[PDB]
């Protein structure tokens, strides 16, 4: 049973835009962003950064 689904939209940092997406065509698998005045990190698939 689903007991809660926190869905948020995090921004993509600049250095992840120019260096990664615009240049290499890839995007990081971890979202690091400031939300509710705290620095939060979300690791995709509870795994390493990729």
């Amino acid at each position: 049973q689903f007991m809660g689904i926190f869905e948020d939209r995090a921004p993509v940092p600049f250095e992840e835009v120019i260096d990664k997406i615009n240049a290499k065509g890839v995007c990081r698998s971890t979202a690091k962003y400031v939300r509710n005045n705290m620095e939060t990190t979300a690791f995709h698939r509870d795994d390493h950064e990729t």
């Binding site: 049973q1 689903f2 007991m3 809660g4």
Partner: protein
């Protein structure tokens, strides 16, 4: 002088008309929505309060 006469007169054709304009009003129909509101609430029961 040989001055002019009355014009020929417009030959008018009697008839019935129906005037159609472009349809912008949406097609409407009665539908029926079957669904289930699932609300799961997590409560922390304190000493005096919830």
């Amino acid at each position: 002088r040989r001055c002019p006469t009355r014009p020929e007169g417009q030959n008018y054709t009697e008839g019935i008309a129906v005037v159609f304009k472009e349809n912008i009003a949406p097609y409407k129909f009665k539908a029926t929505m079957y669904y289930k509101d699932v609300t799961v609430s997590q409560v922390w029961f304190g000493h005096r309060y919830s």
